[PDB]
Design a binder for this molecule. Structure first.
Ligand SMILES: Cc1cc2nc3c(=O)[nH]c(=O)nc-3n(C[C@H](O)[C@H](O)[C@H](O)COP(=O)(O)O)c2cc1C
Ligand SMILES: Cc1cc2nc3c(=O)[nH]c(=O)nc-3n(C[C@H](O)[C@H](O)[C@H](O)COP(=O)(O)O)c2cc1C
Ligand SMILES: Cc1cc2nc3c(=O)[nH]c(=O)nc-3n(C[C@H](O)[C@H](O)[C@H](O)COP(=O)(O)O)c2cc1C
Ligand SMILES: Cc1cc2nc3c(=O)[nH]c(=O)nc-3n(C[C@H](O)[C@H](O)[C@H](O)COP(=O)(O)O)c2cc1C
Ligand SMILES: Cc1cc2nc3c(=O)[nH]c(=O)nc-3n(C[C@H](O)[C@H](O)[C@H](O)COP(=O)(O)O)c2cc1C
Ligand SMILES: Cc1cc2nc3c(=O)[nH]c(=O)nc-3n(C[C@H](O)[C@H](O)[C@H](O)COP(=O)(O)O)c2cc1C
Lengths: 174, 174, 174, 174
């Protein structure tokens, strides 16, 4: 009944965030409570110098603890997740994702870096003890037609996202 | 209702196999179809020369097709899964694990190679399109009291196996 | 002064092998000891059942011992190196690549799996203690004009092979 | 003749930085010019919001371009490099490490995460086009006796660092 959507892009507007926006609306439609976070919710110095007393982190940690699921989105930066997202994940307590379903989403400039999700991001989410990690959705930039005014995807990206979200919603029932 | 267990060790008796035998004892007490396979059930020339016509391969793929879950165990060889296991995995169809929940297990000579499960094995299981990959269990060789005569594990390893199997069991029901 | 080239494809003729044949043509014009091996040079039962007494294994290990560099090529299977190649790699001694410079090459059905080289193959070569691992070359199947009758590559792939081999050549001299 | 040492830890004093300090002194002794950077050299907001016009980044980019080699150190955070270090690496231009020798160093709370170097950090350094990546040195925290007042390591850590640094220095000669 409660889901956190987390945007890992440092820019605004963000292509990977449009996937999260589409996800939010589907989940709202199914009467799931969705709480959206992004890196602007945190003081940069708190993130970079890994300062655990951050008030926003406290709120975020508390909200995560109460969430049944997490949807996390990232750009591919240098064949991995964004450093910006990792600075926040690094501040989460050990076992932060224990008992939780996790759906990872990424967008990349080249399809050449599709494996960044499986080989880089999933291992960090598992280190946080995610109970289940879903297959995820990678899309290269050309598959997101609009991320500035209204999330618009090619039909194949939209179908893969629909499939992922259905699987995630079914998972939230245990 | 149906589960495949797959041992990936080239040798026998095997530590990683004794892990699967323990899983089966726990599932045999729950009215389940458990189908067990090892690398011995296939011809070495079929596996090394990637022969798709292989008769055991056909049997295995059909059984896998109708199964709802997979538990697969490997030794850690050169900081990854065994080459032997991978020759079989390479022969499965592109989407062989689609819609199935997967539980990876491994044994390793040193705790220093614990991450072989998250960074090497899981991306291959994801390439096969696993719907959900569970956290899994790594056991280092210090934890296997006996694997020749029957599974005997130190208490820390048993609790972790027990926990993973509960999750696997619960995950199978949807 | 001495180099091992190692083909990791279970099949022949092979795309990834045609890459190694091109390397050898370039090194044959530089007064070099080049020693070439493939998975056919070993018995399938030895490799699948991890037999350390293997007679070809012994020959290979000695030759590898005195060699200054290694060029190894693999197809991409299930988002990683071939299982077939890995069965041989699993049989080498713990520090087999110590003090040697290594050049990894791969071929893949899609550019989407380019990262299999950095995330899957290189950590195994590092487990074998390679002194230096070079950047390497991934070639997708679109770039191999012919591999049956002789190596024929699109110009983009040839320039990249040429560059990697220059680095490998230069690296061998210390 | 010019080397950049880069500290990826967000804290001060840093255990992984003591390795870099030991490296600096060895290299100074061999009349190499060593330029040390850490994350405090950058405004946090420039790092987090990936702002390429950062004056410090300009200076850092220019110094890196002129360097023959790079030594980069990181703590293991969540089974990978630090996010803080990744935010800086993310701001480097494509091909930033082309033509350069790279020695990666890491310290981790548990030996269980030794593979974080091979499987997480090296692929990012390769994405930046490093010409050669050395084996590297991982050490769990217990091997660094002092990082507050004077870098002091166990004899085995000190020997592995000496070996790595010799290899790096030899490499700087091409
Ligand atoms: C600093 C930076 C580094 C990037 N590195 C990569 C890369 O290594 N591989 C890739 O496929 N795309 C790379 N890109 C492109 C982004 O992944 C891509 O444009 C993405 O959709 C941006 O998502 P966002 O708008 O949510 O930030 C990079 C972009 C930036 C700004
Ligand atoms: C494969 C690829 C890799 C990239 N790597 C970087 C990078 O490393 N650093 C950077 O500033 N931009 C990088 N870019 C550029 C960004 O993607 C840039 O923000 C984008 O091209 C501008 O278009 P956009 O705003 O619509 O995403 C990369 C782009 C691609 C396609
Ligand atoms: C060829 C070979 C290579 C191995 N390499 C590693 C290794 O890289 N890392 C590790 O932790 N253990 C390594 N080991 C130890 C095995 O992973 C360990 O003994 C494991 O329990 C074997 O399980 P099994 O009995 O099911 O074969 C290796 C063992 C063999 C036989
Ligand atoms: C069993 C098998 C599995 C494969 N899986 C992948 C894959 O996961 N990703 C990919 O890019 N290509 C995959 N391919 C395509 C091969 O990587 C590609 O055709 C390669 O060039 C084979 O090289 P070879 O001729 O040396 O065997 C696969 C091919 C086979 C035969
Ligand atoms: C936020 C945070 C996360 C950490 N996560 C891990 C971890 O996943 N694995 C590990 O082995 N150590 C972990 N550690 C311990 C550090 O890797 C270790 O103490 C390291 O030596 C610190 O290096 P530094 O002093 O250079 O920052 C973590 C430490 C912190 C502060
Ligand atoms: C394996 C391991 C994992 C750790 N993971 C975290 C973490 O995720 N978050 C955190 O704040 N601290 C983590 N720590 C604690 C830090 O390492 C902490 O800074 C340290 O225990 C304090 O001692 P030190 O300052 O001498 O390194 C971890 C420690 C270890 C040993």
């Amino acid at each position: 009944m409660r889901v956190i959507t987390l945007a890992g892009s440092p820019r605004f507007p963000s292509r990977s965030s449009s996937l999260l926006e589409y996800a939010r609306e589907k989940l709202n439609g199914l009467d799931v409570e969705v709480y959206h976070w992004n890196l602007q919710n945190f003081a940069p110095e708190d993130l970079l110098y890994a300062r655990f007393d951050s008030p926003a982190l406290k709120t975020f940690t508390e909200q995560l603890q109460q969430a049944d699921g997490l949807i996390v989105a990232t750009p591919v930066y240098k064949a991995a997740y964004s450093g910006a997202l990792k600075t926040l994940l690094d501040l989460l307590p050990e076992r932060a994702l224990q008992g939780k379903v996790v759906l990872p989403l990424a967008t990349g400039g080249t399809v050449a870096h599709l494996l960044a999700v499986d080989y880089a991001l999933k291992p960090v989410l598992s280190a946080l003890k995610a109970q289940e990690i879903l297959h995820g959705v990678f899309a290269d930039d050309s598959q997101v037609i609009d991320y500035h005014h209204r999330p618009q995807f090619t039909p194949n990206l939209q179908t893969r996202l629909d499939t992922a979200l259905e699987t995630f919603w079914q998972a939230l029932h245990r």
